[PDB]
């Protein structure tokens, strides 16, 4: 499995043809919804296994230290707490490559235990709402 910046065509191909794959065939989403005014101003990630296409996210910078980590996809015959860790890692090395220093995501609640042990902490009140089972998590690259 290797992890590389989008820095061509065919690359950001691969990323948007993952996230049809999973989020508007698997999932049911608009492909038009997905792929956003956001994009052009994001840097991409894309992770290969074999030649495969088989993972990717987006890096958008909200300012000059914080980036948000969005658009995350991995096909389902890859997914698992080890894909998870090294996309992430890969991730994190991107945005320290870039300049950043603050890594922001939004994670639902199963997922929690998996960033904490990445060392994010979460951000926001003390309390969900019912119905709210989503938090932003932050961590610090440096």
Known sequence: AMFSKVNNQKMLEDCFYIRKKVFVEEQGIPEESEIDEYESESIH???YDN???????????????????????????????????????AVESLAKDEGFYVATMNAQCHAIPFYESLNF?????????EGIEHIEMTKKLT
């Open 121 to 129: 902490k979460m951000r926001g009140n003390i309390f969900l709402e």
């Open 45 to 47: 990630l894309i992770g």
């Open 51 to 89: 030649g495969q296409p088989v993972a990717t996210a987006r890096i958008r910078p909200i300012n000059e230290t914080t980036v948000k980590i969005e658009r995350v996809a991995v096909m389902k015959s890859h997914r698992g707490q080890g894909m998870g860790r090294m996309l992430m890692q």
